[PDB]
Symmetry: C6
Subunit: 272 residues, 6 copies
């Protein structure tokens, strides 16, 4: 059954006993509750692995994908229990890493998690990403362009669809790039850190990173945190401290790169 | 034309029967014709069937007369869905980016993609004067003080965001070159955390959402905008605007300073 | 002419929502125009305005008429009391309108209908310059009482709705009316600031008031001190000029600059 | 004279809303004046004021009278408890008034009714200069206890309503009353800041208090330190002078400058 | 004497509103004083205070007295639970009072009743200077546990109401009581900042606490670090001095300056102005 | 040992308010201690802690024990679900306590019970220095996954209550436990900033956690980067030292300074 969209009562014992999917507080063994800013989210990891295996097994993955877009959307959802995060203050996602879940991205053994590609509007993030020959590009919160006509570009509307689609394809062993996390930068607000960027963005990036790590996948996402010019280095350090990997691009070329690999953390750099 | 009147009574988000209703009826269940989106924290719905039906009646009519007679019916084209907390299942909702070589437009270049083209500049930039020199078919007037220009039959006055967007989408669908003077109320009304230049970053997301709803509907809208950036960060704010829409023209002294367009044959840059 | 409802109207009851704006619902009558200043919803009723302006013309004594009809004029401009009344009209402005047949003799012979603002800092002499333009009536709002208030031609008001109703009634009755001042609009319409630290909601409020005057074919004149930071005065004054039918900058009770949208185009002086 | 309602009044029930402001509704009695200081709604009842001031005059012993009548003075100035009581009166100020028949002997023989504020930073000696003007009573509000509070002529008050009721009663009873001080108004009336980091709502509050005093034909004198940033003190003092009937700047317990709205026009010194 | 209501009282029900402040209503008994610190409403009950302070004076074991009577002590200072309880008293301060009949031997022989604050930055030596003044008891609030908590005459407290009730009981029982410290008041009383960077609500809170002490004829001593920016320390310290009966500025566990409102006038030293 | 209620408890119903904190009311049982971090109310139950710590001691395999008892440990530290539960305890801290009978061998032989924080900026090597102190278990919280998470001696946690319950259970079971890190406390405990732009509520939260550990006679060690502005690092570190039982400043995975509240007085690296 589809996740409930009716708001679940937080004062009724019968409502609260139901699963997160069904508007209650009780997580099923397949459900992982997490948060991005004040937004609660659930990923159904077991439904995710099953849908990805079905996609891989299908006669035509492109046809299967179109035919099952609603089932896929149900993999990541906002649980609708009222005040659902009330029992889990300062909710992050359990940090995990395995030498048995590494990925060929920039280095042969990148840990599972999130790799962000950072730079301003003239950085050439999309150009550099296209040159890394990904299998699919998830297009989110960006203006429509000729690139969207490609079969390998998948358009999504909200955060839950973006995550459901990207996690599905990454689980199915596609190299997934998300263009972009613009709406996360714009939407995840609150107290700013010494760089001028909301600290809830760093916590959100670690939450998304650790959901990818738990699911043994790698997601690559473009992001422009729009730091003030005097604090760019601090903001970029805070982003690197939140995720499995980070590439800074300028003129569609790598300025710096840092990755948490199966054999240790590495750092590279080349001034523009 | 038979179009429903969207509900204005607030719909309950805790009652299963209310939530099961369509977006036009105060619930959460989108009909095949309904597209839910957001501009800032404002939820909106465009109804594709009300749009195609009413655009056909507009084509068959005299826009000024038609819009006066059908003012009540156009509320069905773009409306705020009145379900309580309607965006709760769709956090950070944008509009799916789309483009087609079969939906291109003759504006500045022969093959401008569907979307939004913004004309940018400060108070003395001459945005209105440059726009009038591009000889549009209709100018929608929104959020600006009354001027002699408002007496013209080709100027249609609107009051809120939903009326502005419904009139614009209907005219563009009916093949009119429509210009909006202006998006001042979007600059003033879409608030939140500021990025560079002191401009709310939610404005850039708002522009992308409007751009992509136009792209989905295969139309091009043109709009004047003054983002009121601080003087030291104008170039950065204008770059952020260009990164949000199908096209942007920077005007000064009612002349083009620079122009950038997403066309069917790639990105075009001038100036 | 009846009093608008002050009981809050339910936004979840269909019978309450179907009612007119004056009756606590959402349905505008043909005579009602819903608009907003900041987060404050307002309605002007064109029929209450025309009917009561005729009663004011018949009295030929504004000072006495306004004291006696304090209750009735609430029908002309009021806050509609439907809960969340602006929910169907996001980013609500007022339709821009102008006509060569609704022009006014103020500074130029053919000033468009709308709002003319007189701008300057504390000590600029806005009141003194205004008095020298020999208006017929001065509406006194949000200013400390002074000897000027004893004059029969000074009409005191308390809130925004009374100020606007009195102003629109006097202007419709063909009086040259000046409002001293829009201090409370500067102080009360706040939110995200643009340059100078002035709330951009103030510019939207001035355009909304301007366009209601334009729709009603009247001209209102108001003194305003936006209290911009000293480094951004020129920018704030340009933003104010971009919001209304006309603007006069005063210093030492003399014109520094003036810009007007007239029936024959934009006029700039100084 | 009866106690105002303290139960919150429903804003959605017609029977509750029809009640007077003292009874938790929205309908002002002829004796009630609704006004606001910041977001705080207030009512002054003219009949409770005139009745109780006559009782105070008859006692000829303010210190004793105020202790015995503490409960009754709640009727003079109170917060009306109707829910969302200011909803029909956005940006509510108080009608500016002046009369040559209500002038006062304070610094000049014909000071208009209103509020006179005494300004100065720390160590200015606002209290020392004020005590040298030989007031009849000093109301003590929001200040730490001092040997001065032992004096029979010092009357301690706790909140804004008690301070205003005691002040209006004493002034109506023809006492020269000084308020030490408006510190809690500076601290409590918050919002968007103007120059100097001073909330512009403070200027509107001072004009509202000034105009209530002017309507009631009394003069109140109050010490205030708006705590402006050092670079903008002159601008903040200009904004205060523009908000009230009179203002004195003190240093070393001496007058540095003074400006008053008098029955014969504005008077300026230094 | 009994613990106050913790059930929230209705503000729309006439019967609930008619009840005393301790019983969840709005009607102050003659023994109740309503005041506020920031947005926190508080009530001190003079009868619970006088009754329990007399019991503390008579106690053969004061340390056990505080633990044994912890439930009754909630009656002395409490948050009244009427909904929107401050609605009829906007900008509520506490009536300023002073008496030559209620003076105290602290730094000077005739300190007025009120609050004396000891001010200084992190590492100023406020605790060390206070301990050198040989107080009878130290209330420990919002500070990390230290050897002091086991070795000296001290009483550990958890929240603002317990801190104030314990302080008022000890001072009424004629103890020289010091509070280490008011850091949770500095951290918790927020809002619009003064030209100093410090919330002006902190100054109003200090005057409210000062005047409750003055009304009850007691003197409380408290350490405070307002955490002013370095360029505005002098302004913040002046605003604090203008809010209370006395203030001592300490640096390197020594008096830098002191100002006190005494029964015979202001007594001060080391002042830069 | 039963699960605390997650249904929100009424604050206007006398029967609901009379219930224990675990059961959604306001009445603390003799075993319950109510405290707060920021606006977050918390309860530690001393009987759930001693009962489950005894079960953990008996298992002698923390990783396996924590997987099997994940539901039970919710009784040790939980958010009480009574509505407005902190309403009778404004500015709630935790009673400061110390005892010569509850000292710990950490850096010095007699460190008082409480919290010891390890501070340093990005690249300071806090985790590396901590690992070199050979702790028995490292709790991993609010940090990106790393090769270190593969170790059996690393236990991953998700929220503040799980982090504190796991830490208190391990310390009560006589494990030297280190927490990597308090990054989510730095991000999550917001409000008015003091010097360096650090929220002063962070200092109060560190004292509350310190004093809960002191009351329970345990020592917890945690890494923290308070992310002060560069000009006020020294002041922020002094404010942190003033809030807890001990603090170590690390740079290049080496001690630059250390201060500890010991059973025999304050110990400083300045000596």
């Amino acid at each position: 059954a589809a996740p409930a969209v009716v708001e679940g009562s937080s004062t009724n014992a019968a409502a609260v006993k139901k699963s997160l999917r069904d508007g209650g507080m009780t997580a099923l063994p397949s459900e992982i509750l997490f948060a991005v800013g004040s937004i609660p989210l659930v990923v159904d990891k077991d439904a995710l692995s099953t849908l990805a295996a079905a996609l891989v097994a299908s006669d035509d993955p492109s046809t299967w994908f179109v035919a099952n877009r609603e089932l896929i959307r149900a993999v990541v959802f906002v649980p609708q229990q009222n005040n659902v995060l009330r029992a889990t203050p300062l909710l992050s996602v359990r940090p995990v890493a395995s030498l048995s879940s590494v990925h060929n991205w920039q280095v042969r053994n990148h840990l599972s998690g999130l790799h962000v590609v950072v730079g301003g509007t003239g950085a050439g993030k999309s150009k550099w990403l296209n040159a890394q020959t990904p299998d699919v590009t998830i297009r989110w919160g960006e203006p429509g362009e000729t690139f969207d006509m490609e079969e390998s570009s998948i358009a999504v509307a909200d955060l839950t669809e973006m995550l459901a689609v990207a996690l599905l394809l990454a689980t199915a062993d596609y190299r997934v790039v998300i263009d972009s996390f613009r709406n996360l930068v714009f939407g995840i607000t609150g107290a700013a850190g010494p760089g001028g960027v909301s600290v809830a963005l760093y916590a959100a990036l670690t939450s998304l990173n650790n959901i990818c790590a738990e699911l043994g996948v790698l997601l690559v996402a473009a992001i422009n945190p729009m730091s003030s010019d005097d604090k760019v280095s601090l903001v970029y350090n805070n982003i690197a401290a939140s995720v499995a990997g980070m590439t800074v691009v300028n003129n569609a070329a790598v300025v710096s790169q840092t990755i948490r690999s199966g054999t240790g953390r590495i750092f590279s750099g080349e001034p523009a």
